[PDB]
Amino acid sequence: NEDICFIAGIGDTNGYGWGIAKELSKRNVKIIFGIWPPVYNIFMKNYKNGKFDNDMIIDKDKKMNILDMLPFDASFDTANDIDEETKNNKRYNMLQNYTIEDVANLIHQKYGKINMLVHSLANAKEVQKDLLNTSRKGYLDALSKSSYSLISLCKYFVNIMKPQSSIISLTYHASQKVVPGYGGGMSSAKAALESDTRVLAYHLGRNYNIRINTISAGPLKSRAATAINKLTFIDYAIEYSEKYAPLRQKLLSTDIGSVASFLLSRESRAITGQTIYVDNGLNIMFLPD
Amino acid sequence: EDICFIAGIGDTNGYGWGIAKELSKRNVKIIFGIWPPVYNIFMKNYKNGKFDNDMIIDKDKKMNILDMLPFDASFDTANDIDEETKNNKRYNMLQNYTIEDVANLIHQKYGKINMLVHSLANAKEVQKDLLNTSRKGYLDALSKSSYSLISLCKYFVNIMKPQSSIISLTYHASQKVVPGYGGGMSSAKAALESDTRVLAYHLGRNYNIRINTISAGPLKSRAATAINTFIDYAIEYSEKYAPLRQKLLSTDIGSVASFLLSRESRAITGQTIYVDNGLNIMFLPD
Amino acid sequence: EDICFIAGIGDTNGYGWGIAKELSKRNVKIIFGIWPPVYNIFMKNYKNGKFDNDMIIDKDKKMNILDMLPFDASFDTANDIDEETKNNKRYNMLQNYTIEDVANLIHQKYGKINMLVHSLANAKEVQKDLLNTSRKGYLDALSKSSYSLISLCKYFVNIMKPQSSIISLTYHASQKVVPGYGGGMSSAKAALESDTRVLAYHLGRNYNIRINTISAGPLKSRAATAINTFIDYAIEYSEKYAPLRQKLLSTDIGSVASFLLSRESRAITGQTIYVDNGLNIMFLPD
Amino acid sequence: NEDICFIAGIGDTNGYGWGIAKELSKRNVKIIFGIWPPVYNIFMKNYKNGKFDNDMIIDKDKKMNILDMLPFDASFDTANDIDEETKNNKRYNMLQNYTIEDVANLIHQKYGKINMLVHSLANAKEVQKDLLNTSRKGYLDALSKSSYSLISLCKYFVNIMKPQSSIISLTYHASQKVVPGYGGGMSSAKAALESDTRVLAYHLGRNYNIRINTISAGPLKSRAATAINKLTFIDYAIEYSEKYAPLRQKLLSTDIGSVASFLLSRESRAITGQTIYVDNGLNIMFLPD
């Protein structure tokens, strides 16, 4: 029935955004990528040069179909928020309509209303620092980019979404339990995001009949995950998860993708405001073996 | 060839039926576990076509029911049945309805299965507040509503394939106070949600089998009507205050169940998943 | 004239004793409820001065023990005792040890009390994993460890003053998986924490009485030693990974209990309070 | 044994800061007030003129003793963070050493090391707006003033605190469950604060043997609470609490104070990283009557 999904936060094929795209594509949902301007050019070149073709293979019966690929920066709500420096920066200078409001408008003009929205991004300048050593600026950066970006995303996309639409984001259990090394206010940011998902579920539910949930994912060696280490963090997390989770299988990006796909579909019609753990059951453990 | 056993169907008005309907959409073969005191009433209504409209999925298909068997979650094995039950008019003409007996019967008739649904509860003192519940009444609630899941798992894992999946149904009274949800049902649900985690660990590590529980919102089922207009209140409150105003349907729980029982959810286990139009997230009635 | 009944003291090595010591600091009169199979051993050790050093509070004072009574949380009333127990060598020389009988005895001897501590648990199959626990074993855990709180409340409220306060002890295995905490103890604790909320509502509205539960970290008590080196592991893990490295003492739980039982906490009820050096907040062992 | 407590966030006698001061004073703890510069002058005048004397009465046996009263703005980590405008603002111009670091230094110089710390402040420019209508600036303001201020407070005060010291803040259940009207990112901010309390408990515990907890308080008609209403919010909350809480008594500021006092004392030695509800049990309810 022409399901269309905007995925905010893909920069290569190694993260959760790609797994989500892949699983949605299997269900025939049309995909639009929102790509952060620092990685946008290299994403487009790699794509054009066929570097992603193997990764786009669904089952060798089918391959992913990408409707569109758009520059997107979740730091900026509207054109008026973009500082002169950023506007003129080498990587931004050749790009247009990349703020949250502008991408919503652009999508609406080209394709009309959509019914699925994925927030799959996060950022924090001081992620390598422990919370106690994080500055005011660095903490506010984490909240701005990782948490506020969801609210803003919702604010502007609800106008271009049909009733009974669905929105998902991605979170991590460090919001609820202590993960040393998940620094820079990222733990704080995921805690805010999980709480905001409830408040948004209430308002979007009553005022638009739109659902919103978040997926608390287990560890995946994405490009962003690698950046967490100082002086690795993700290696430890993965090793620990595969050794101690109730389910010992390797956690795949498409494992999250298939849950995202369910949550974005009408099958999850009575679920909203929730944090859903897709982490091989690791979250349930207290004492290891 | 997916097969699901659904323990706890008494008519077409509860969550078991909605779960059956939705699994039927995905062409899963369904086997009903029916409490013996209502087994013959159910079979008669079924034979008489009372459930026919309720069995329609759409233009294409109609529910495919593989089998319907008497099943009593009060009893683990044949040895556990008391004489009063043996001498009951409703039980005396039935056989092989203990938890172990039904596992053996299903396995003998159809081989290994890969989906298991616990959709049952009982508490002989549900109408009393917790403080006025007796020891026998409280332990009955836990026996029928909580331990029954553990025993179901114990006997059914042997007849299940690797990567199988199990769900039960719970209610948010385990976590926040619902006056009226009495007789130790709130306790039973708290135990069920906790047991779901412990079972998830053991079943996952030993068998690669998953187990989850769905925390459902209110539905005007037969069991619900037995709690003391309680259900009319809960439904009215939910439809007034839940983030989503839609009427909650048994098939809304059914489609979540179907997802949790399928391989699409291979990385989810030990979880309480809320399917209640968001009501659980609210604090202050607006 | 504050009086506290402490149900579940068997020696000086568990949390009941630590709670007794701390309440004694505040000059609360303490009455011990002692499980009959260990009642005479306890009385003999006490008479023989084995507990004397353990009774010292400081330079000033020593624990003031008002009374010590046999108490069995298995039985609500005299009628509930089975003949095998009646004919037991340890029970036959004792009397008035059912929950109701002890409430009546305390009230007759000393009048109304204002503090109640449930510091007991039992599970006959604690050494089995949940999946291998039988119905009788699982219901025993719930009967002795969970329902006992409800019944304690039921019978003791009549002998308590308005604004009285009640606590029990739980463990984080109710909420997160602890392999080894078997026999349905994890289930019993989940039910206990849930029941604490439901009881809080009813006791608060009807009697202005508060009830809370303390989720304690590991202590090398007699009961703990019976779980299967499990306790040595938990202690070692806790002292290695808890935010606070201090050794957890029974009196660390005792001073929290004393606060929860006093009027300083008049606005706290229905809560699970973690007294475990912060261990529960951790996800990833650093 | 000369217990000394710094209370960050008092501006009159109607809030939780005053109840906390009163209960601590009963235990003979010496109190130092950190007073936000916009209300500081009026606080000092009222005090000098004896306007608080009745409110300082403990039991007519005893009256509160306040060791010191210091201008304090939790927006600023160090002197170097203060913008020229604020430095020169009418209400700030005559005040000195009011940043987090400067007050810590000042306290240390005058009285040596302390052992108790209370964060009893919050702020959010757009509190009257629902989350969806909150701007990026307004949301970041809520997190900065209500959440980051705790981390910073901890960072600078740990150097002037003894081992086995204790720190508390105040939070509200809107972090966990939806409270329509608790707007501007305050819900997000309390969610971050509750999560930060865990991460801080871990680091302060291991590296300083210092405890930190937060109290999730029920509704109290403080000056700040009144400011929440638009176009009242607190009236509704109070009425609802007294009608539906397990305990029907009126919730008092000193009810929180006596819990704060316990948590700050050695009696709570094995408790850290926790959210403790002091709300007459309201949080435990699902369905009202």
Ligand SMILES: NC(=O)c1ccc[n+]([C@@H]2O[C@H](COP(=O)([O-])OP(=O)(O)OC[C@H]3O[C@@H](n4cnc5c(N)ncnc54)[C@H](O)[C@@H]3O)[C@@H](O)[C@H]2O)c1
């Ligand atoms: N990787 C994990 O193990 C893991 C575990 C739990 C949660 N998550 C969450 O999943 C999400 C995806 O992260 P990932 O792990 O796939 O890494 P990723 O790099 O694949 O995803 C992050 C992407 O977001 C983009 N991005 C960053 N800032 C942006 C901005 N201001 N505007 C637009 N785009 C921006 C980046 O270009 C990047 O491609 C994150 O929110 C993360 O918190 C990841």
Ligand SMILES: NC(=O)c1ccc[n+]([C@@H]2O[C@H](COP(=O)([O-])OP(=O)(O)OC[C@H]3O[C@@H](n4cnc5c(N)ncnc54)[C@H](O)[C@@H]3O)[C@@H](O)[C@H]2O)c1
């Ligand atoms: N209906 C609701 O509002 C609601 C909300 C949350 C959870 N639930 C849960 O959903 C599940 C299904 O109940 P329902 O609401 O559909 O009502 P229901 O009456 O349709 O289902 C309960 C069934 O359990 C069966 N049963 C009772 N005792 C049994 C025993 N000893 N052995 C085998 N079967 C037995 C009954 O015959 C009945 O058919 C229950 O576990 C309930 O706790 C229901």
Ligand SMILES: NC(=O)c1ccc[n+]([C@@H]2O[C@H](COP(=O)([O-])OP(=O)(O)OC[C@H]3O[C@@H](n4cnc5c(N)ncnc54)[C@H](O)[C@@H]3O)[C@@H](O)[C@H]2O)c1
């Ligand atoms: N020790 C720990 O590590 C730990 C951690 C968390 C919680 N707890 C809880 O603290 C409480 C006290 O146990 P403990 O650890 O001090 O061990 P303990 O052995 O000192 O206390 C348990 C007591 O309960 C008594 N008891 C057993 N069955 C009884 C019955 N039917 N009626 C009356 N009394 C009975 C026993 O005689 C024993 O003295 C328990 O409820 C336990 O679950 C203990």
Ligand SMILES: NC(=O)c1ccc[n+]([C@@H]2O[C@H](COP(=O)([O-])OP(=O)(O)OC[C@H]3O[C@@H](n4cnc5c(N)ncnc54)[C@H](O)[C@@H]3O)[C@@H](O)[C@H]2O)c1
């Ligand atoms: N009042 C309630 O019902 C309630 C319920 C739950 C939690 N709380 C929490 O209790 C705390 C105290 O608030 P309250 O309700 O007592 O109102 P209050 O006005 O008594 O306390 C807030 C005080 O903090 C001060 N302050 C604000 N910004 C500051 C800054 N940047 N630097 C220094 N000081 C600043 C203000 O001058 C004010 O006096 C708040 O954190 C609030 O979130 C209050």
Ligand SMILES: Nc1cc(Cl)ccc1Oc1ccc(Cl)cc1O
């Ligand atoms: N995308 C992103 C950005 C930053 Cl700065 C930090 C973590 C990020 O994602 C994550 C990666 C690994 C894990 Cl275990 C959790 C995450 O949330």
Ligand SMILES: Nc1cc(Cl)ccc1Oc1ccc(Cl)cc1O
């Ligand atoms: N099936 C069953 C049996 C008993 Cl004794 C009590 C409730 C039962 O189901 C429910 C019905 C309505 C609601 Cl809101 C929750 C339930 O759990």
Ligand SMILES: Nc1cc(Cl)ccc1Oc1ccc(Cl)cc1O
């Ligand atoms: N008192 C009791 C009885 C049984 Cl059967 C099992 C554990 C018991 O107490 C405990 C001891 C150690 C830990 Cl870590 C948790 C407990 O709950």
Ligand SMILES: Nc1cc(Cl)ccc1Oc1ccc(Cl)cc1O
């Ligand atoms: N101190 C403060 C500042 C702002 Cl902007 C909003 C709320 C504030 O405190 C509160 C008041 C009432 C309630 Cl029920 C919760 C609060 O947290």
